[PDB]
């Protein structure tokens, strides 16, 4: 691997469902690359009969200097209209990945708990979901990292 992930911090946690995800990412690039790096955030929800996946946001970073790199990725929140009501207040996953020329080489997975912010709503969840009352809590200190060997240049 030409790129090593050195640190990753969620800056705003817990947060509203509709708040952007702020990831402070520290990495090192060990030699010059021809292309930019593409950071992506993916939502994965699990309902009874299928998963729902959403590409939440992506950003191209480059040209990448050799050595240490650090930035905050502020990723757009999910499109709630694409998520079943029951899944909006469930445990879900987000996957933060980096790719090179379209090839994913690192993936950082997080558990996320979503619940209503009022006792009455938690115990009597309404038929018509009230997204402004949903709070997310990312399990930010226990990242689930996967690395993949890729072709670089």
């Amino acid at each position, epitope marked *: 691997s030409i790129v090593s*992930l050195l640190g990753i911090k969620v800056l705003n946690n817990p947060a509203k469902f509709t708040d952007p995800y702020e990831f402070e990412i520290t990495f090192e690039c060990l030699e010059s690359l021809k292309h930019d790096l593409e950071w992506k955030l993916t939502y994965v929800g699990s309902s009874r*009969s299928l998963d729902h996946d959403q590409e939440l946001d992506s950003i191209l970073v480059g040209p990448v200097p050799v050595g240490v790199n650090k930035f905050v990725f502020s990723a757009d929140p999910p499109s709630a209209e694409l998520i079943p009501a029951s899944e909006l207040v469930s*445990v879900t996953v987000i996957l933060l990945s980096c790719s090179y020329d379209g090839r994913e080489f690192v*993936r950082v*997975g997080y558990y996320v708990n979503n619940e209503y912010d009022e006792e009455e709503l938690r115990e009597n969840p309404p038929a018509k979901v009230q997204v402004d009352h949903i709070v997310r809590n990312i399990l930010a200190e*226990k*990242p689930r*990292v*996967t*690395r993949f060997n890729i072709v670089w240049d």
Partner: antibody
């Protein structure tokens, strides 16, 4: 050439302690989660403890919480399991394994811990 | 948090075999399947419910329905008689199923 090599297993009496080590080869422990999973003869796999990268945060099985501590020394590229207050029921082969997302990809060959009166 | 059955089954080479585990949650990322043979460490087959691990034969597959997770071997080969374990990597705890030993008929 990824390898995890456990050591430190041996005979110990109840109430005693042991420190297991897991020496990583072919990879840097700072980039991965590391896990201990044990198995008694003829029995199933039982997860013991996990440590996560970047934070060094930890998780423990209820059966070992308060007695065992998992840690890592990234400069030595080694993970550890400090086992205090050992009980007869802790006898098992102890595997160290590397995290692969939510799964475990490379497992060591195991070190035997034998608690005896 | 994770229950596996049965503890054993008997089958023949060429048979389609399925093993199911019931998890406490439906999160697909959390479940993996392992193979273990006597005297050896476990080997990863499937991760995140349905992803085939590098180098594992295509006859192994994983699926999910609700909180039920299934390992399928499309056609047992002679080297597939072994014990199979599911794993749930949960919010707080990792739980392994009790294991299913696949034995050979005669």
């Amino acid at each position: 050439e990824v390898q995890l090599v456990e050591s430190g297993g041996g005979l110990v009496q109840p109430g005693g302690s042991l420190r297991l080590s897991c020496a990583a080869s072919g990879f840097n422990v700072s980039y991965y989660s590391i896990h201990w999973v044990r198995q008694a003869p003829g029995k199933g796999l039982e997860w013991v403890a996990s440590i996560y990268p970047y934070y060094g945060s930890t998780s423990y099985a209820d059966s070992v919480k308060g007695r065992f501590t998992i840690s890592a020394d990234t400069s030595k590229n080694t993970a550890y399991l400090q086992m205090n207050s050992l009980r007869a029921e802790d006898t098992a082969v102890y595997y160290c394994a590397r995290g692969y997302g939510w799964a475990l990809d490379y497992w060591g060959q195991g070190t035997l811990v034998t608690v005896f009166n | 948090q994770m229950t596996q059955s049965p503890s054993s089954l008997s089958a023949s080479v060429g048979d389609r075999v399925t093993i199911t585990c019931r998890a406490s949650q439906s999160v697909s990322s959390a479940v993996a399947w392992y193979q273990q043979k006597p005297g050896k460490a476990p080997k990863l087959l499937i991760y995140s419910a349905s992803s085939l691990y590098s180098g594992v034969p295509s006859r192994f597959s994983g699926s999910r329905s609700g909180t039920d997770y299934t390992l399928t071997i499309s056609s047992l080969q002679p080297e597939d008689f072994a014990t199979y374990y599911c794993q749930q990597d949960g919010w707080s705890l990792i739980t392994f199923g009790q294991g299913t030993k696949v034995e050979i008929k005669r």
